[PDB]
Amino acid sequence: RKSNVGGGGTRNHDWWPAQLRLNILRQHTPVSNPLDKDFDYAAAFKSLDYEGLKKDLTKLMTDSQDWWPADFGHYGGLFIRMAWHSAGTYRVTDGRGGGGEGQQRFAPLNSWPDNVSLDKARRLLWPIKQKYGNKISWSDLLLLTGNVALESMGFKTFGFAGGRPDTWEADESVYWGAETTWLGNEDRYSHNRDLQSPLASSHMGLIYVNPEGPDGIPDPVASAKDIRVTFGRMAMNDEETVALIAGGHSFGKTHGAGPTHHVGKEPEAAPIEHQGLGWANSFGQGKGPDTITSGLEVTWTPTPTKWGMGYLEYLYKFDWEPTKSPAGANQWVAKNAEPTIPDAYDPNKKKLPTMLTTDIALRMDPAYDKICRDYLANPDKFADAFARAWFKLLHRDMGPRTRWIGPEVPSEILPWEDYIPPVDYQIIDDNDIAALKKEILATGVAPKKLIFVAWSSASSFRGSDKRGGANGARIRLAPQNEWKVNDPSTLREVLAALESVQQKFNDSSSGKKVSLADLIVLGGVAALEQASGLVVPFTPGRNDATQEHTDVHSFTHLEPHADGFRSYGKGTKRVRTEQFLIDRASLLTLSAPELTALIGGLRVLEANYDGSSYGVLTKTPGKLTNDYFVNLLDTNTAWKAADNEGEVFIGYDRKTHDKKWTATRADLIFGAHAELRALAEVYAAVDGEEKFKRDFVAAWHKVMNLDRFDL
Amino acid sequence: RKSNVGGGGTRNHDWWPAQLRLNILRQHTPVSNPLDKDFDYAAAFKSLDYEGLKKDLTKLMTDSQDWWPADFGHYGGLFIRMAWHSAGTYRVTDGRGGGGEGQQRFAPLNSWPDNVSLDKARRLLWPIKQKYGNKISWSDLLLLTGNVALESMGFKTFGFAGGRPDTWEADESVYWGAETTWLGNEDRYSHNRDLQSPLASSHMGLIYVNPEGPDGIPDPVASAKDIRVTFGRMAMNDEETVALIAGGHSFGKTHGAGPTHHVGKEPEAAPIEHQGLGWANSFGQGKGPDTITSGLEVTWTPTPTKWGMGYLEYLYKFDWEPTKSPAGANQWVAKNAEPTIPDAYDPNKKKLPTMLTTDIALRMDPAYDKICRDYLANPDKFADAFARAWFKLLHRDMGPRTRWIGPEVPSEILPWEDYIPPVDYQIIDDNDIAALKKEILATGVAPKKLIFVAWSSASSFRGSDKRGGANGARIRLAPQNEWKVNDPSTLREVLAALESVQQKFNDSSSGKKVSLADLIVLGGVAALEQASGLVVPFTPGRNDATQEHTDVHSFTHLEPHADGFRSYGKGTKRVRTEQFLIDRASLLTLSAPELTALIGGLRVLEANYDGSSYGVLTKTPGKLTNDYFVNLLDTNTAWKAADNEGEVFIGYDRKTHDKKWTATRADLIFGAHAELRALAEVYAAVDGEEKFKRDFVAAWHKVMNLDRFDL
Numbered sequence A, B: 001r002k003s004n005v006g007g008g009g010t011r012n013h014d015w016w017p018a019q020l021r022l023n024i025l026r027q028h029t030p031v032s033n034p035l036d037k038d039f040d041y042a043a044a045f046k047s048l049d050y051e052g053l054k055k056d057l058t059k060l061m062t063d064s065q066d067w068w069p070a071d072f073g074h075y076g077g078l079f080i081r082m083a084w085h086s087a088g089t090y091r092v093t094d095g096r097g098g099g100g101e102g103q104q105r106f107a108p109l110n111s112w113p114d115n116v117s118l119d120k121a122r123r124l125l126w127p128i129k130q131k132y133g134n135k136i137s138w139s140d141l142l143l144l145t146g147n148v149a150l151e152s153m154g155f156k157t158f159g160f161a162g163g164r165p166d167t168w169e170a171d172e173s174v175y176w177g178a179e180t181t182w183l184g185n186e187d188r189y190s191h192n193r194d195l196q197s198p199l200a201s202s203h204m205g206l207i208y209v210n211p212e213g214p215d216g217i218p219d220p221v222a223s224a225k226d227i228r229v230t231f232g233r234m235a236m237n238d239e240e241t242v243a244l245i246a247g248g249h250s251f252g253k254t255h256g257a258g259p260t261h262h263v264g265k266e267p268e269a270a271p272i273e274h275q276g277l278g279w280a281n282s283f284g285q286g287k288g289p290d291t292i293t294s295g296l297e298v299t300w301t302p303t304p305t306k307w308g309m310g311y312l313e314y315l316y317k318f319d320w321e322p323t324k325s326p327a328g329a330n331q332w333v334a335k336n337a338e339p340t341i342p343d344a345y346d347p348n349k350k351k352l353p354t355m356l357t358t359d360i361a362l363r364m365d366p367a368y369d370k371i372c373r374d375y376l377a378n379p380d381k382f383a384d385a386f387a388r389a390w391f392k393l394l395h396r397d398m399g400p401r402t403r404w405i406g407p408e409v410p411s412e413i414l415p416w417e418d419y420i421p422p423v424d425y426q427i428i429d430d431n432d433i434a435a436l437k438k439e440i441l442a443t444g445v446a447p448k449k450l451i452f453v454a455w456s457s458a459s460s461f462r463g464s465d466k467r468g469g470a471n472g473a474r475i476r477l478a479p480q481n482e483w484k485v486n487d488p489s490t491l492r493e494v495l496a497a498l499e500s501v502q503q504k505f506n507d508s509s510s511g512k513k514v515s516l517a518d519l520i521v522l523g524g525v526a527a528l529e530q531a532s533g534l535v536v537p538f539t540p541g542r543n544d545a546t547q548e549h550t551d552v553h554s555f556t557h558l559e560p561h562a563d564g565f566r567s568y569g570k571g572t573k574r575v576r577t578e579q580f581l582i583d584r585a586s587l588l589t590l591s592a593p594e595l596t597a598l599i600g601g602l603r604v605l606e607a608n609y610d611g612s613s614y615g616v617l618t619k620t621p622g623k624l625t626n627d628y629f630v631n632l633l634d635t636n637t638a639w640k641a642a643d644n645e646g647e648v649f650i651g652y653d654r655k656t657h658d659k660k661w662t663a664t665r666a667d668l669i670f671g672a673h674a675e676l677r678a679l680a681e682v683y684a685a686v687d688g689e690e691k692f693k694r695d696f697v698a699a700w701h702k703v704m705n706l707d708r709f710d711l
Ligand code: HEM
Pocket: A071, A076, A077, A078, A079, A080, A081, A084, A208, A209, A210, A211, A227, A244, A245, A246, A247, A248, A249, A251, A252, A253, A254, A255, A293, A294, A295, A358
């Protein structure tokens, strides 16, 4: 804070709100990481006493600690929430969020309004995290603990893959909304509403929807529409939405034993003496039977520490009546019923059953209604589907099966995976590679295309959920075959040339074969050698995918609205074209220097979709040089907008005024922004030529392999 | 800006203004840097065509560019102003700011109200920067252009020294005040006020002082107070101060041909088309004879492009009257004077002698007054005074000679460089080291003392300007011997033991000799093994300093307010205790993992001044274990404050409730902060025992070698 010390004062974000920042290209550096330089987590995890650990959590499940006591002597209810919440922030839209980086430890997710009391949950595990050392990450353990909680209450699980490495910095690249007030929502919206992309929540500080109902209004069919969209954003359908909410609230209790005004400050504003614990409660004890968490006082089942079919049965057993909690919140009561649900602390005492508007949405919603009914008709199809949705939930952002590790990895290939079969033939060596480059260039396809269709294939990767890339060559499959930015016409010509080159090399020839995936990328490397005069690295082993394993609705999210690398699209009201470009480079895990080299080169090589003259700042296109940067930074050139929208520009001579260049904001920001201009200059110098060229080939080859977890 | 995408939305600094951030320990990493991993700038600068570059810069002086024309056919004064403004941010208070990391080209120094048109001056140097590749960096290129400018105009410089590497990110560890409005000053201050440490300027966005006068009030003796303190904070005394103002303002002019409403938006909020050129001016031609920078229309001497005495002669030839510039700013005109100075563009027009309020402050002040006369009565002294104080200005934030590269490095030693004479003797070999480690422990000085003192030597470093550290053993010289944080009673006992040991060895030996500085650092390593059972590295070659070469006045600024490492001091109203610890950590160039490992180890070895047991969380102290972390993260403990101010705390048995430990905010931040808690956890695992020890020994040596530029 503006404290007269290092770290204090007004900063650039204060003076220049609108200005572009390259922060997100500087995250998760080794400098912030404690572990040994050569430490590898996957190798460490594989050596974990995994069984030993599972037994210790089940021991913990009943090991009620006195500073945060166990409702019904069981922490399972507490630990299924923690993990629902770890994973439940994932959103398909941009693929950010999820449990995969253990960010719940950190702000803001540690101090969210929906994350009350999970700091204590998280703390109850420290004695185990301390026992198992580096072989278990917080990322993993927080989800595994959720799985052990179910198993220990008589619910069978579908499986569990580990291998999520821990992070050490709060992840600054996630857009949670612009509100600036918790629980707020007056912007993420503009019934009949449209939650803006990429958001998958109705309020700031909340996981999916509101339990009290929209804006806190107990209208369950209005709350149903919230749940269909938000869970839709998180990749979930209606069947899976019903299995999750039922199976979830089949265990547990809520904590609103009092007026919330009695709760204190969240972990990040809490006093230092509380050691990462916030929400200090003054209502009576503050913990145990007096706990105050969300303000609603509900318990859904007769057996909160044991699996059964209580939640659905009870929902279709009474008529429900809206009431209010002991803290003043919109909840539902049962029009009639001897206390069947038991108290958390009095064994003797029992109470009438009750519910949550959201839960009540499942009955009042036309569709859910039914699903809710097929599950009662089949208390099995529902045991299965919950485990299946539960595994999907926790591993939706991990990526390809290649990244999954552990004794309990499942063998059933699931539909949402984007599965690629592992190569079951002999891979191409050096002589076959050399022989294929020649054959690809010999077809007579213009090198510019090969290069364009190489990048389009590779550029799909978004390293956040790890989906997309050259592997599997889905570029030939829907929806990518008809994406406007892929140039379907040229996409198909190149692909047709590669199809023949393949049948030629696989045909009757014995032993080895080559995927269209390896050829698509190798065509690029073939073309790029010819154009750079340098050796370009190439790793084979990609395989081809089938449409079956290509969820056309899943992949439609990856299509970009704007793409600076390919000179596609324009900005919006709230986002400038340069803002997308960094958002894309962050997604491709590219550094700022990496980004700079890539644009300078892709341009000179004309990788512009449709094929326009934008930023092709060379008089010898198709030949890799640093002409782009020399020309960009030229002080004898000037730039005028050629459109009032301010998306296209025109470079002209300052003295003679003759026109020279067209360009897009994707091009001029490298002159305009100070820090990016500092990288342009290195490549634009007279010594910069050959260095840029190597860097381009490094950065090119990096992009080409982003999805190679099989290595 | 909070726009629906990666990069946007509300952040943790919005939700929690007061919350501690560790950004300043994740800076200047190598992921942001475009140069090869094997590039060494000092090596590249050594091979630069330095003379050839110099010729090209003289050629640049009189090579007017029609898009930003040269006043009087010479860009010299513009360039001097450039160089004075880059260097001009430096403050002794902490060492931050200055020319040393080329930080003018980045926000916010690039968009400061005091740096208008320095974007054009910078930009004018890009063809040259482009021609010398990376062999000449920006940091150095800006400063060297100042020297050549002077040399081109008949002035003999003292010397020049390169070796400054370039930065690639905006430096965010600098506090330039708390104001949120450009030129604001209400906060800094709180005719007889006090400018808060560590600022060295009167207004936010200005280099030192207001040219118009204190709050735009043309009051010469009030302006002189402002100048004294601001230049004293930037290390210059009155004799130097007067030489700098009188040297600079002996060349060129100022610019304010029209009202300042005619200038548009600074670069970081300028339009993209302008390409990081800001301050677009609608007045007339908007450049050349219609230039507007400050808004003052003054031209100091009759020869703006040739060194000579004009500045002081004219100041002392006429008597002055206040008037206003075409922009409406307070300047001064002479009474009864004939048009002597010349116009920058018309060679047949002349105007009246003009001056500035700050410049009038030099004749009015009775201290500055005399010095000006002294310089008027002695012209070759004034030259001397200026070339020295000019050299000082450009090389104050650079460090010790060892750092200073190039053909124009002076052979004469200056009174403020903090010179340590080179080692002219044979350094100790491993046999001597072993032998000497034994003779140090044989004195019977407690290891605690050897570890306290050894660290107190190293701890004094600062990367801001690279001053302090264990070389020279200035912990024995004033002021560091009388520093309360250094516990002077024990510092004496240690130093007396090492002096007799040094004597011994010393003379006893033949050909070889050992320095007191090395025996201090070597005391700690010999003590740290005994405590750890490991090998602690040691790099000899340090030498000792004499009081002569220790600038005490400058050294006072290095005394801490709070030392989190040694358990000293309390916060401030504006600054918490931990915030100092992070400021000091950054200044020591430590990563957050290095920081965490260092507290743990220092506490357990009882390295607390005076000897307080605050944070010594071990039942077996003097021994290196990870007991600090195990006992700080233990879930069965809780803390409460036990001081009249909440600095100290008491750890107690959450169950039995009896007292265990005493602690301080320096220690309780590793349990409070989410990010720092994550690092302490690594070292608190059962398999982090021997890992911690290593990392402590790696980082303890890292800190003991921060100032060893002789490598
Ligand atoms: C829109 C959907 C949902 C909403 C709005 C929601 C909201 C809530 C709220 C407010 C609580 C009370 C927790 C407290 O304050 O102490 C609760 C409890 C719980 N929810 Fe959900 N929930 C949803 C779906 C689910 C799902 C899908 C699962 C699991 C897959 C789940 C698992 C739990 C568990 C285990 C508890 C018990 C908390 C405890 O005992 O500490 N919920 N839920």
